[PDB]
Amino acid sequence: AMIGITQAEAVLTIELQRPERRNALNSQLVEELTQAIRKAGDGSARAIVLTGQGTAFCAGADAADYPDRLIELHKAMDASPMPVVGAINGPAIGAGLQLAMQCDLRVVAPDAFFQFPTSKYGLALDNWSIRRLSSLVGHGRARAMLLSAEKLTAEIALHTGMANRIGTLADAQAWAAEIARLAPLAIQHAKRVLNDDGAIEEAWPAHKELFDKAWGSQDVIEAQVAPKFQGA
Amino acid sequence: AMIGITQAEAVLTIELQRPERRNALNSQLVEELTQAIRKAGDGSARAIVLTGQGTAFCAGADLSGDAFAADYPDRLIELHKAMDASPMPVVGAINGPAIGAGLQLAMQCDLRVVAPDAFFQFPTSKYGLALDNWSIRRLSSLVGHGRARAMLLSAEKLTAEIALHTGMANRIGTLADAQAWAAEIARLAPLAIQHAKRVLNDDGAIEEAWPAHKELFDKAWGSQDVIEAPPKFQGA
Amino acid sequence: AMIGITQAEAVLTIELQRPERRNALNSQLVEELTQAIRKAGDGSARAIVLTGQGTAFCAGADLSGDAFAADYPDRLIELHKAMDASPMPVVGAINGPAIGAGLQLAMQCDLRVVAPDAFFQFPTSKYGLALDNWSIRRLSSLVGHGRARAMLLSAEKLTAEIALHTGMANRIGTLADAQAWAAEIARLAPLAIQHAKRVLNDDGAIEEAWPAHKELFDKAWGSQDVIEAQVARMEKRPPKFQGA
């Protein structure tokens, strides 16, 4: 009901279908997406294309079980033997940027941008988000994106390698078709090794302390109301 | 005496003021900068801009005739520690060349706004010296491994244009541009910034030298090639 | 017999001389290269330039008809160890395609000067093979994680132009350009170069495969798909992979 699943020969296309919410992740969407990823391997299909309806790829989080479901989604994508080509049709923000980064490859529409607006909202990220972002845009730009909420445009994404290509859903599907013809076991090995570069990192004690501090702060409530931040 | 400190609203600007030596570091200057960084919070500032007076950001280290030269390595460690631990983001307004110790200092900034005529360089291979592991790891993260190899193994200069290409420079601009950006950053949520800065700085760049690294480090520094730098080297 | 060695001033040039196979590695070539690297400092040389004869830098590995093919992986380990341990900086003059084992070799050079028509590629996904962890880590560090994913998962070629963009190529230029730069580097302090090279090579790229990595590596190398890729190439047709 919140995603559409279609297959053309050996490519499975999964479309986020909450355009009116910019494909914001709620519990139902995350559950349905997780199942789609896990069931993609009933192939036939040897590649997945993940894309969104409307102007946005995914604008972030939209409830008690939501964090656990989100972890399970990322686990399912990380563990999938199939390569996921993200057709980033528009902005990927917050949890939506996390989702875009969990794709194996990215084909990005000209008007898409990538952003962690965490510094505007007083929030804090998990370590993987920061590490994978650093690997994809380079440390310098990651510092700007994280400390100042800087938007990464499609053009700079192509520059850094966040975007493998600039293009459309059709372009992504065409590439996924070529990839679907390659040797699955070679793809599986490389994906596992690449994902095991160290980005999957448990927060250090200092990181957890600051993380909990930010999430429990008054500044988070203040940013919603407005901002006059206090540092507490 | 060797730095200037000014504040405009929530932005503190710290300026290295030794233009007679192109802002080359010594014990006094380093200690003064360290205190400037540490006290930066005790006055409601939310962002720091670090910059150099005159044509250079920081041309390196010049310990003549520093009566406290023996304290210099310790003071430099303290300066880097203070910047790394500072809850406020430090925008480097790299107004001109950042060389050696000056490049290390530039890289310890949280963000960089680089003047069009500035360049970055480790001339260590010309002097027969060796760097700490952090300098090498942080450089690799900022310019990419490939360019890091050229900068370290051949003393290649990184222009402002290529700095922007790689992300070493976040922007090309002036002190005023850096100050304007800092003012925007100062309006953001401090706890969010602190967390991200901590995690980013804990990417593994802060690394104790391996046994083989220490042995080559000590050999380089204790070498006649350092004394030599016509600087015809012997490798001894 | 498979390498040429010349020296001008303090620069030793090592030329891969198996152009008939586009300098594709075998046991003999690798052993000879290893010896040249190890002996490079027995002269007055302070820098090495490594380059290929003919159109290619190194098109991969070709073990037909290598009587010592079973020695190849051990010889390859020794080559990479010799280059990693060499006190001398190696400037790769990548005169043409560097593919598979050739890309590995190019990446083990300390610096790269790349001819305008050269490209880099790991066609592993076309052949059903799997790489050691170092190749993947060093590639990611040179082209960036994003491009590394495309090169590894989709056999994407890295052009000279994009190599320059990412830093895989330090310069676009010729053998003479590489030799000129090597001469400059040869005038620098050897101890400083040695320290920096050691620390840079110790960035974590030299990594033992994790248990899951080894399991997938062995599975790929032992698969029917590897045979199918060789048959399909021998029959000039698209391969029909099974995922086993």
Burial A181-192 (b: 16+ CB within 10 A, else e): bbbbbbbbbbbb
Instruction: Point out the residue among A134, A149, A207 whose CB comes nearest to the CB of B198.
Output: A207
Contact A213 B193 (CB under 8 A): no
Burial B37-64 (b: 16+ CB within 10 A, else e): bbebeeeebbbbbbbbbeebbbbbbbee
Instruction: Locate B142 and state its tokens.
Output: 């900022």
B69 at the C interface (CB within 8 A)? no
| Chain B from 140 to 199: CB within 8 A of any A CB | 141-142, 144, 166-170, 181, 184-185, 187-199
Residue type (1 letter), A67 = P
- Write out the E strands in B115-220: 119-121, 158-159, 171-172
Which CATH number do you get for residue C244? Answer: 3.90.226.10
In DSSP terms, which residues pair with C20 in a beta bridge? none
CB neighbour list of residue C83: distance below 8 Å, 6 or more residues apart = C37, C90, C108, C109
To 10 degrees, what angle do helices A127-137 and B190-201 make?
70
Best CA proximity match to A201, nearest among B190, B137, B200: B200
Contact B76, B41 (CB under 8 A): no
Contact C160, C172 (CB under 8 A): yes
- Number of domains into which chain A is organized: 1
Q: Three-class SS of residue B193?
A: helix
Residue type (1 letter), B23 = N
Length of chain A: 232
Rounded CA separation C10/B76 (Å) = 37
CA pseudo-torsion sign B92, B98, B102, B106: positive
Q: C158-159 and C119-121: which strand pairing?
A: antiparallel
Rounded CA separation B97/A132 (Å) = 31
Q: Three-class SS of residue A47?
A: strand
Rounded CA separation C16/A182 (Å) = 31
Order of strands, sheet of B171-172, starting from the edge strand that comes earlier in the sequence: B3-8, B11-16, B47-52, B90-94, B111-114, B171-172
Neighbours of B226 (CB within 10 A): 17
Q: Rounded to the nearest 5°, which phi and psi values hold at B208?
A: -70, 135
Task: Check residue B61 and report its DSSP letter.
Answer: B
End-to-end C-alpha distance for chain A, whole angstroms: 41
Determination method here? X-ray
Residue C83 sits in which domain range? 1-244
Contact B192 A118 (CB under 8 A): yes
CB neighbour list of residue A53: distance below 8 Å, 6 or more residues apart = A15, A16, A17, A18, A19, A23
Neighbours of C222 (CB within 10 A): 12
Distance from CA of C63 to the nearest CA of B (A): 31
